[PDB]
């Protein structure tokens, strides 16, 4: 029986750009039960703090509320493993919240057939409730994809910052499937939104 192998902290993510969460992979537990903790050091301060919330994001995670999360700081995260035999610390992770932003999928996807005179379908969706695009703090960009019921090729349309988009090249008759996803002005793409489907008039 031996002290815990070295733990491996791999993924941090920020859903809203005001909080963020970190997840760790436990090391070889050397045969015994192992208690974990996370400690971190902000850029500027020479003071090390312990994680504020081991409960909010669940098992093997650390959640940083607005109060603890500051953007444009490099965090130096390290995770610690202690059992009865000994204890070991992981390699330090340098984390900068600014570049770990990955938002939830868009909601309230809606589809309408409209006509101005020709006829077009237009997609209308909303962002995640947690991101704050209203105050300009979180600016967001969207994409949409469409394909007929039985196909293996989606067509992609970048919609900018518009939570709507009118589509014109659709063929009258067959039903189409549509999905959106979002991105921060600078960030990562989200998981696609629950698909909607509508058939198109003749």
């Amino acid at each position: 029986q031996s002290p815990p192998g070295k733990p491996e902290i791999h993924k941090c993510r920020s859903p809203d750009k005001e909080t963020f969460t970190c997840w760790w992979n436990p090391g070889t537990d050397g045969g015994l039960p192992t208690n974990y903790s996370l400690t971190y050091s902000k850029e500027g301060e020479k003071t090390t703090y312990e994680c504020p919330d081991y409960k909010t994001s669940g098992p093997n995670s650390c959640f940083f509320s607005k109060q603890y999360t500051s953007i444009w700081k490099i965090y130096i995260i390290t995770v610690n493993a202690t059992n009865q035999m000994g204890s070991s610390s992981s390699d330090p992770l340098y984390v900068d919240v600014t570049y770990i932003v990955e938002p939830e999928p868009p909601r309230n996807l809606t589809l309408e057939v409209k006509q101005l005179k020709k006829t077009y379908l237009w997609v209308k969706w909303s962002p995640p409730t947690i991101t704050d695009v209203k105050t300009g703090w979180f600016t967001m960009e969207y994409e949409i994809r469409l394909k007929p019921e039985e196909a293996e090729e989606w067509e992609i349309h970048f919609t900018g910052h518009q939570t709507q988009f009118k589509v014109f090249d659709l063929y009258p008759g067959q039903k189409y499937l549509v999905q959106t996803r979002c991105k921060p002005d600078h960030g990562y793409w989200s998981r696609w939104s629950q698909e909607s489907s509508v058939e198109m008039p003749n």
Binding site: K17, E18, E43, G44, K66, T69, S70, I71, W72, K73, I74, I76, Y94, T98, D132, V133, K134, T135, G136, W137, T139, D185, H186
Partner: protein, 186 residues
């Protein structure tokens, strides 16, 4: 053009486009430099606290931004910007006329060098338009000649901190454009 009149709305609308562009360009340029010269090695160990604009009273979260005065905020953005004039210049200069056969990192350095000035020009108009009753930290030291880890650690940090500040600038300008023009409803 019906208006003469250079609308504050249109001043933001233009600024936010350059500040957005400038950021994509500096984030791509940092990636072209990481890929071709760093890509691990063991940097950002000597990059923490290396930024020269760190000393400024820069808003850190969304609540601190929300607490700040609009005209003090703008003065903060300009300070940041002037601050970056000299380092950009040296970047372009040191990559062109000192670097032995440089890559296409130069072409997107020059772009930034130029678009920054253009955005500062536009940022001075808007600080001017909303009068400040009030009234910036300087360093750009950058070595020539690439081998020698000590020489391209400094390059790494300039790139790293160009990426950071360009972001702020862009994030503050969009924060602001929504507050005063769209009354936080955009």
């Amino acid at each position: 053009p019906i208006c003469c009149q250079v609308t504050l709305r249109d001043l933001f609308d233009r600024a936010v486009v350059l500040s957005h562009y400038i950021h994509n360009l500096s984030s791509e340029m940092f990636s072209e430099f990481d890929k071709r010269y760093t890509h691990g090695r063991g940097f950002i160990t000597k990059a923490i606290n290396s930024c020269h604009t760190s000393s400024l009273a820069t808003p850190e979260d969304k609540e601190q931004a929300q607490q700040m005065n609009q005209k003090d905020f703008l003065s903060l953005i300009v300070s940041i910007l002037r601050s970056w004039n000299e380092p950009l210049y040296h970047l372009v200069t040191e990559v062109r006329g000192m670097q032995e056969a440089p890559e296409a990192i130069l072409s997107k350095a020059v772009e930034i060098e130029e678009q920054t000035k253009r955005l500062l020009e536009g940022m001075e108009l808007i600080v001017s338009q909303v009068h400040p009753e009030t009234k910036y930290p300087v360093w750009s030291g950058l070595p020539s000649l690439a081998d020698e880890e000590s020489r391209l650690s400094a390059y790494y940090n300039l790139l790293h901190c160009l990426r950071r500040d360009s972001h702020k600038i862009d994030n503050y300008l969009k924060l602001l454009k929504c507050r005063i023009i769209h009354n936080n409803n955009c």
